[PDB]
Each structure stands twice: as C-alpha cells, then as structure tokens.
Assembly symmetry: D3
Amino acid sequence: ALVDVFIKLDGTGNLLVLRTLPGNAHAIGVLLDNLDWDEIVGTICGDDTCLIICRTPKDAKKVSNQLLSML
Amino acid sequence: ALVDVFIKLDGTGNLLVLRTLPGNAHAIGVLLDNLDWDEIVGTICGDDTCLIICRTPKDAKKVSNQLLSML
Amino acid sequence: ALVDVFIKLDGTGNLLVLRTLPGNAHAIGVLLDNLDWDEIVGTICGDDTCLIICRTPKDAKKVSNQLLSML
Amino acid sequence: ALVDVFIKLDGTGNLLVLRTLPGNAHAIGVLLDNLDWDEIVGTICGDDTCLIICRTPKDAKKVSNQLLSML
Amino acid sequence: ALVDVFIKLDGTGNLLVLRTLPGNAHAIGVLLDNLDWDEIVGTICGDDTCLIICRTPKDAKKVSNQLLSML
Amino acid sequence: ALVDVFIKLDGTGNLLVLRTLPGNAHAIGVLLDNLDWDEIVGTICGDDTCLIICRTPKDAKKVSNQLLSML
Ligand SMILES: NC(=[NH2+])NCCC[C@H](N)C(=O)O
Ligand SMILES: NC(=[NH2+])NCCC[C@H](N)C(=O)O
Ligand SMILES: NC(=[NH2+])NCCC[C@H](N)C(=O)O
Ligand SMILES: NC(=[NH2+])NCCC[C@H](N)C(=O)O
Ligand SMILES: NC(=[NH2+])NCCC[C@H](N)C(=O)O
Ligand SMILES: NC(=[NH2+])NCCC[C@H](N)C(=O)O
C-alpha cells in the first residue's frame, strides 16, 4: 500500500530516505523488511521517515527504481 | 484505511483497545487523533495496539460502533 | 520544561491524559517518572500523549493540580 | 525471560503497570500479547512501562499472580 | 529549545549523530524536519539519538555549524 | 542477553545493521550505548533493527567482531 502513504524518496550514496505520512514509517518498514531484497542491508524507521541502508550506491539506485515502480 | 490494518477492537469500561497489523498502530493513531471525536479523551499507540481513552463506557460503546462501521 | 511542550491536561477517574507538542511525549514521560510521586502508579507515552495512571480519582485530581501548578 | 528485565508490577482496578529495564517494555509486550490470556484485553508499551488492560480488577489480580509466578 | 536537550553532536562523512537527553530525540527530530534545510536529506530519531542524513560531508559540516550556532 | 535476541548482523562501510527479535531493538540499543565503545559514534533503534554508526568501516569490522564474539 506504499502509494497510500508514500510522500517522497530521496537518497545519498548507498542510503535512501523514504518519507511517509505521519506515523506510517513502521508500516512501510514492515513492507521493506518483508521484501528481503539483497540490495537492502537493513531498514530503520522513526515516525515518518524510513532509512534504507543499501550495500552500494548502485544497489541504492536499483532499490529506488523498484520502489518508485510500485507507485 | 482502517479496514486495511484493523485486526480487532476490544474494550473495558471507558477504554478501547484497537489491535492492528504489526507496525501500524501509529498510523491509525493519527487517524483517530484527526477525527477529534468528543468521546475520545486521547489515544496512545505502541507498535500494534492503540489505546483509546474515552470519557465513559457509554462514550466507548459509541466510539466502538462508529469505528466498526468504517469496516 | 513542561510549560514549553504542554498543550492540554485531561482526565477520567484515576487516569490523566497529558497532551504535548508532537514528539515530546517521552520527554515529559521522563520528567513524570523522575518525580516518583506516590499518586502515580505509572506512565505510558506515545508520540504526543502521556497516559498517567494514578491510584484513585482523588490522587489523579491531586496530580493534575501539581502538574498545572508548574505552568 | 521476564525475570531478566522485570523491575516491578503495580496496579489499580482492572489496570496493571509493569515496569521493566530501560528499553525493554516492548520485549515483554511481545511476551504478553503472545500469551493471549482471556483476562488481558490488551497491552500498550512505552519505553520501560507496559500497561496491561484487564477486563476487571479480579482478572487483574489473577494476571498479576500468574505474572509474578514466572519470576 | 535545542540547547535545553542538546548533549553532543558528532559525525562521519555525510552523517551527523545528534545525542539528546533521554526521550528527547523526536522533539529535536521535529525541529530538524521543520527547518527543511536543503543540506539535510532526512532525519531518523530513536530515543536519545537523531541521525541527520546530509547530502555530502560538506553539507554535513555546514549543518553541524548552523546547529552548534543555536547553542 | 544479546544471544537471546540476536538474529543477524550485517553492514556496509562504517554502518552495522543489527537485527533482533521483534520489539527487542531498544533493549540491545541500551546495551550498546552502555558499552560506550570508542568505535561506535552512536546507535538508533527501531522495533527490530539497530543501526550502529561507526566512525570508519575498520571500526565497524572491529565492532562487528566483538559483537559476534558475545554470541
Ligand atoms: N512526530 C514526530 N515524532 N516527528 C519527528 C520525526 C523525526 C524523524 N523524521 C523520524 O521519522 O524519526
Ligand atoms: N513488535 C513489537 N514491539 N511488539 C510488541 C507490541 C506490544 C504492544 N501490543 C504495543 O503495541 O505496544
Ligand atoms: N505522529 C504520530 N505518531 N501520531 C500518532 C500519535 C498517536 C497517539 N496520540 C500517541 O501519542 O501515541
Ligand atoms: N527513555 C524514555 N523514553 N523514558 C520515558 C518513559 C516514559 C514511560 N514510562 C514509558 O515507558 O512510555
Ligand atoms: N531507553 C532507551 N530506549 N534506550 C535505547 C536508545 C537506543 C538508541 N540510542 C536510540 O536512541 O534509538
Ligand atoms: N513491527 C514493526 N514496527 N516492524 C517494522 C520494523 C521496521 C524497522 N526494521 C525498524 O526496526 O524500525
């Protein structure tokens, strides 16, 4: 249901910062962790932000593309 | 929204305990706080549980019915 | 400190619901727990709401008074 | 592993307040939710406090006894 | 506000790690997110630590400077 | 302690991602912060993931080895 709470997807190097509606970070964090993509080392969620730690910037770009493709 | 994460709605006296999918408590906590129902004194969310503190058991029954009606 | 984030103090029976600025519930929760008032059985904080569980409605009124006196 | 993080168990009416070591509330919240005791309506965890909402004070006393028996 | 809870500001590359008083991470996280500085890609808060993800190490030094200037 | 909730330890560069049982991230976050290892700049915990920000990938390898040695 990413499109229902997704707000913005930014990034730097091997890191992606996914911004969601208030209080929905952990909901997508659950989604992300359940994908278990090899490119994602791990995810950490606060209240409206999800930090996706990827192996490399290239894996980040890849994850970013697959994520935006779900909207 | 609610129907997509709702799992169970229980209660005792003036208290309602809303159970949601893992990591979705704060998402509905935002929904509940946004409704600003006079019956709801306040809400506190953990990871998958939302505690809705109502003024009286009567107000709780009322809130429970309006909540279930959105399912 | 409290006056800097305090927004509203409500209650029912032996329960008090303290509303704070977004993300400041746990800051006050720390304050409350550090007071160790005999009247307060315990505190549970979400994002902007603090549930203060008091022993009796009378202890709740007492706690409410002391809290508002710090504003 | 309750005994490893348990600090104190208090209560009022149908409510129980379980105090744990810092950051361990959700760990026991998981334990409590997995028990699915009929007496427990629900649980809400903060950082070091777990609020156990029981149906009645009698169910609270019962839950309290079973919990302390695990230490 | 920041000076009231600020404890330490560290960093590595494009990342800044802001340490605050216990339970005050999200309070500052709200402050940071409200500044919407172009240098900050995003923020993630735990209990007493705020991770500020900046675009580059240079933007991190900049953000660090502006932050410490508010003390 | 750690062995009782530890699930996986991954990493990239100066970052380590520790995965724990659901709801146990902050319990080990407390453990990590209590160690005050010079290698660890800081830690941020969500629900089941702990992000350990180390100064360099070398420090991360070091921290990773001492962590796994406690298993
Ligand atoms: N209502 C709040 N807690 N706001 C602060 C959010 C801080 C940070 N963006 C996070 O998601 O962790
Ligand atoms: N993954 C977890 N933290 N589970 C424990 C949840 C405990 C309790 N139901 C709460 O929402 O606060
Ligand atoms: N940004 C948010 N997480 N909002 C939801 C808050 C829900 C509830 N009032 C609490 O403080 O736990
Ligand atoms: N480090 C902290 N967040 N302390 C505040 C705890 C507030 C309250 N006792 C709770 O467990 O929700
Ligand atoms: N009382 C606690 N929860 N302590 C653990 C804090 C872990 C980490 N420093 C964070 O802020 O996320
Ligand atoms: N029950 C949950 N909230 N699951 C989502 C966890 C997301 C992420 N691994 C974190 O610990 O922040």
